[PDB]
TrEMBL record, chain A:
This is Structural polyprotein. The chain holds residues 816 to 1253 of 1253 of the full protein. Oligomer. Interacts with spike glycoprotein E1. Interacts with spike glycoprotein E2. Homodimer. Homomultimer. Interacts with host karyopherin KPNA4; this interaction allows the nuclear import of the viral capsid protein. Interacts with spike glycoprotein E2. Interacts with host IRAK1; the interaction leads to inhibition of IRAK1-dependent signaling. Acts as a viroporin that participates in virus glycoprotein processing and transport to the plasma membrane, cell permeabilization and budding of viral particles. Disrupts the calcium homeostasis of the cell, probably at the endoplasmic reticulum level. This leads to cytoplasmic calcium elevation. Because of its lipophilic properties, the 6K protein is postulated to influence the selection of lipids that interact with the transmembrane domains of the glycoproteins, which, in turn, affects the deformability of the bilayer required for the extreme curvature that occurs as budding proceeds. Provides the signal sequence for the translocation of the precursor of protein E3/E2 to the host endoplasmic reticulum. Furin-cleaved E3 remains associated with spike glycoprotein E1 and mediates pH protection of the latter during the transport via the secretory pathway. After virion release from the host cell, the assembly protein E3 is gradually released in the extracellular space. It is found in: Host Golgi apparatus, Host trans-Golgi network; Host cell membrane; Host cytoplasm; Host endoplasmic reticulum. It comes from the Viruses. It comes from Semliki forest virus (SFV). The chain crosses the membrane at residues 417-436.
UniProtKB/TrEMBL annotation, chain C:
It comes from the Viruses. The lineage of its organism: Viruses, Riboviria, Orthornavirae, Kitrinoviricota, Alsuviricetes. It comes from Semliki forest virus (SFV). Acts as a viroporin that participates in virus glycoprotein processing and transport to the plasma membrane, cell permeabilization and budding of viral particles. Disrupts the calcium homeostasis of the cell, probably at the endoplasmic reticulum level. This leads to cytoplasmic calcium elevation. Because of its lipophilic properties, the 6K protein is postulated to influence the selection of lipids that interact with the transmembrane domains of the glycoproteins, which, in turn, affects the deformability of the bilayer required for the extreme curvature that occurs as budding proceeds. Oligomer. Interacts with spike glycoprotein E1. Interacts with spike glycoprotein E2. Homodimer. Homomultimer. Interacts with host karyopherin KPNA4; this interaction allows the nuclear import of the viral capsid protein. Interacts with spike glycoprotein E2. Interacts with host IRAK1; the interaction leads to inhibition of IRAK1-dependent signaling. It is found in: Host Golgi apparatus, Host trans-Golgi network; Host cell membrane; Host cytoplasm; Host endoplasmic reticulum. The chain holds residues 1011 to 1059 of 1253 of the full protein. This is Structural polyprotein.
Length: 438, 104, 49
């Protein structure tokens, strides 16, 4: 046997799936989603960390001259100054009063520690989804992990389940993201080779082990003060610390739909959106013959109490006449109300009780017990507690049944007005026809 | 290494109609944040230094707040209002208006 | 109410009856330690002051 249905993608919301085929007793399936994870495919662009500046000891030449050649090194900056008079604790350094030359140079290299501490830039693509689903029926109660993409298939108790694909393709990450420790940020970053000093991306590297580095930090040297030995230099501070200071608001406290963001690997969990279609193939060993199952005749339904709340704030009583005691499958055939239990026990007494949850003021739904069906309509009152700590356990429906008190009132008003209008039309037609007869 | 940090004091909660009021009594400057689980979230976060009171909206979809270093706490709002939904017509319309104003 | 004025009250200065509401919740001690943890709203008298 083959079957297909759709379930809501809400973690913790029970689903009752009713499967009926002629010649076999109806079956009810309990399906729940315990966790869902959405992970995108990434392509690393670059990483960033703090830097350091290497300034080797300056070169001093007495009664001579020096000239420096360029070198392939990140932001190498060299200069030669004339007319310098170095001093130290022992006294003067050279004979020549004004024939000394000082050669200075400096460059920038990545921090020796920033292997542990770095921030990565990534580009986001289409994301795949995986989930964990709990299935209950008969003596089978098991939790399995599946891929919600329409390809992976699982087997439970000789039954084949196929999940997905998801109805709505929605992702919280934009095209470009930045990852640091355990937070992600949906921000645009400069492309490689075009970093600016003082902002994010002052130094760049293809990967953590790269031997190349692109830096732009405005290394400017200056002439040393007279009678001293030192290499002055002015340079804009590291942009990584600046970005760390005013990064902004992380996605963990801004992501919509109330789903949580985790890293290593980057993923979003419990993203409540859309609905999941499920297809299933069942064997013949999971059903029961009509002869073995009890027979229910003359089924009628009465409601006892109804208060539309988050929990199961509604109780009703079902009366029946049977021939032998046993177990039956109970289901609600409308989305307006949701039942709590799927299997009930029937005895010769002919009375059973059921609990249900609803949201509409005046719900009306068909309840099925084994092979028999009945209709139920109820009058409900709003609750009084304002804030509760558990999630809603009902599908949000508010439109009442046509038999509700308010709809009955509007129907009666419209009916009276329509009858009056029809009377006016008939009177005018009769008058004009009588006038035309002459 | 593994590094030890205290847990903030539990705040005081007072309920209301689609609103909660939190009394916060910090001992150190602490980070307090909150968000809504809807389509467009009204995220907010701030540093608290002295004892203060705050008002947080809780729509029918849900609210989540993070205080100090405790786990985030989630809350939901039921469909509550005043007026009888099975009485005279004016009570009917007033109750439904309590549910949703613009549509009614 | 806890945290505000009048969290503890006494009918007089020498009374023997007292009414207090400060939400004295306990907690499980950390493993391998000897102590008693408790979380309590600060005195509302100081807050009012
Ligand atoms: C010792 O000191 C004398 C300075 O008295 C140095 O002589 C100078 O050499 C440079 C290099 O050719 C000339 O430009 C200067 O004109 C010289 N000065 C004088 C006063 O003649 C000499 O080079 C020093 N020797 C060493 C080994 O350092
Ligand atoms: C199904 O199994 C899980 C795991 O042991 C258990 O928590 C749950 O209560 C079971 N369900 C029923 C209806 O026994």
């Amino acid at each position: 046997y083959e079957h297909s249905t759709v379930m809501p993608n809400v973690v913790g919301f029970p689903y009752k799936a009713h499967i009926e085929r002629p010649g076999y007793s109806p079956l009810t399936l309990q399906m729940q989603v315990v966790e869902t994870s959405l992970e995108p495919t990434l392509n690393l662009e670059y990483i960033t960390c703090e830097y350091k500046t290497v300034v080797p000891s300056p070169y001093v030449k007495c009664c001579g001259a020096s000239e420096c050649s360029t070198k392939e090194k990140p932001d190498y900056q060299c200069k030669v100054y004339t007319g310098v008079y170095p001093f130290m604790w022992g006294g003067a350094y050279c004979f020549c009063d004004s024939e000394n030359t000082q050669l200075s140079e400096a460059y920038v290299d990545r921090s020796d520690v920033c292997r542990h501490d770095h921030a990565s830039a990534y580009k986001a693509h289409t994301a795949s989804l995986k989930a964990k689903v709990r299935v209950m029926y008969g003596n089978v109660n098991q939790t399995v992990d599946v891929y919600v993409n329409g390809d992976h298939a699982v087997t439970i108790g000789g039954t084949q389940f196929i999940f997905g694909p998801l109805s709505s393709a929605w992702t919280p990450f934009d095209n470009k993201i930045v990852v640091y420790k355990d937070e992600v940020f949906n921000q645009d970053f400069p492309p490689y080779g075009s970093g600016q000093p003082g902002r994010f991306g002052d130094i760049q590297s293809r990967t953590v082990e790269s031997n190349d580095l692109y830096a732009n930090t405005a290394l400017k040297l200056a002439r040393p003060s007279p009678g001293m030995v030192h290499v002055p230099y002015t340079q804009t501070p590291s942009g990584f610390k600046y970005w760390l200071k005013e990064k902004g608001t992380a996605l963990n406290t801004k992501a919509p739909f109330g789903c949580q963001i985790k890293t290593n690997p980057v993923r979003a969990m419990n993203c409540a959106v859309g609905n999941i279609p499920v297809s299933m193939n069942l064997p013949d060993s999971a059903f029961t013959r009509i002869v073995e199952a009890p027979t229910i005749i003359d089924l009628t339904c009465t409601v006892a109490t109804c208060t539309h709340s988050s929990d199961f704030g509604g109780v009703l009583t079902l009366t029946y006449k049977t021939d032998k005691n046993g177990d039956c499958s109970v289901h609600s055939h409308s989305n307006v109300a949701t039942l709590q239990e799927a299997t009930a026990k029937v005895k010769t007494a002919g009375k059973v009780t059921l609990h249900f949850s609803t949201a509409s003021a005046s719900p009306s739904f068909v309840v099925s017990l084994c092979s028999a069906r009945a209709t139920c309509s109820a009058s409900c009152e709003p609750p009084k507690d304002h804030i509760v700590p558990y999630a809603a356990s009902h599908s949000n429906v508010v439109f009442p049944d046509m038999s509700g008190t308010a709809l009955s009132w509007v129907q009666k008003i419209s009916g009276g007005l329509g009858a009056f209008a029809i009377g006016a039309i008939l009177v005018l037609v009769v008058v004009t026809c009588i006038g035309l007869r002459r | 290494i593994t590094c030890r940090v205290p847990m903030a004091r539990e705040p005081t909660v007072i309920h209301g109609k689609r609103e909660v009021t939190l009394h916060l009594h910090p001992d150190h400057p602490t980070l307090f944040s909150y968000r809504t689980l809807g389509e467009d979230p009204q995220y907010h976060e701030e540093w608290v230094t002295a004892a203060v009171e705050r008002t947080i909206p809780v729509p029918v979809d849900g609210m989540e707040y993070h205080w100090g270093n405790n786990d985030p706490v989630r809350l939901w709002s039921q469909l509550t209002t005043e007026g009888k939904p099975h009485g005279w017509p004016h009570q009917i319309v007033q109750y439904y208006y309590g549910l949703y104003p613009a549509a009614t």
